[PDB]
Amino acid sequence: YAPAQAQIVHAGQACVVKEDNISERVYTIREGDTLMLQCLVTGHPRPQVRWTKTAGSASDKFQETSVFNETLRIERIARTQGGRYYCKAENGVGVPAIKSIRVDVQYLDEPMLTVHQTVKTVFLRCTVNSNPPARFIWKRGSDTLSNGVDIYEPLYTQGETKVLKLKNLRPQDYASYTCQVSVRNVCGIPDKAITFRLT
Helix, strand or coil, X not given: CEEEEEEEEEEECCCEEEECCCCEEXXXXXXXXXXXXXXXXXXXXXXXXXXXXXCCCCCHHHCCCXXXXXXXXXXXXXXXXXXXXXXXXXXXCCCXXXXXXXXXXXXXXXXXXXXXXXXXXXXXXXXXXXXXXXEEEEECCCECCCCCEEEECCCCCCCCEEEEEECCCCCCCXXXXXXXXXXXXHHHCCCEEEEEECC
């Protein structure tokens, strides 16, 4: 007889895995792809294998595990299904073995854009939800930087926000402005954009 050992090994459609000498630590995968995590076990008799997502406030002594037959599979994984997943191997010999890995679900939503004018200045306010944090690119057909052009995060934000302030209103430069959001194509996630036609 021998006590149970556990080892988490990535499978499926992750884009990035992070590991160290002891075990695999992070499983990064694009929202909507298919997660697969193996739990290889040792010891005799053959250990039973359980998985669990630590959802809730109660401590480990009360989290609902499930007998799972080694391989955890989540098709069309959602941004809300990220976090720490625990493998538990037990064969009745010694103490149960428990390992865990962090799942990072990455995504880039289409951004939101709202306009506001006071007197004549123009504020274009772009928000997006993403993981990892997104890069904001403001364009007028061609990219724009600091023509009395101020680009800043505003004081009040419910999330990732970038404001484009246009101070003077020349006759020229009275057309379309674009907020392009990027995660630099991690996980193969392309950019997205929203355009406002100024008049």
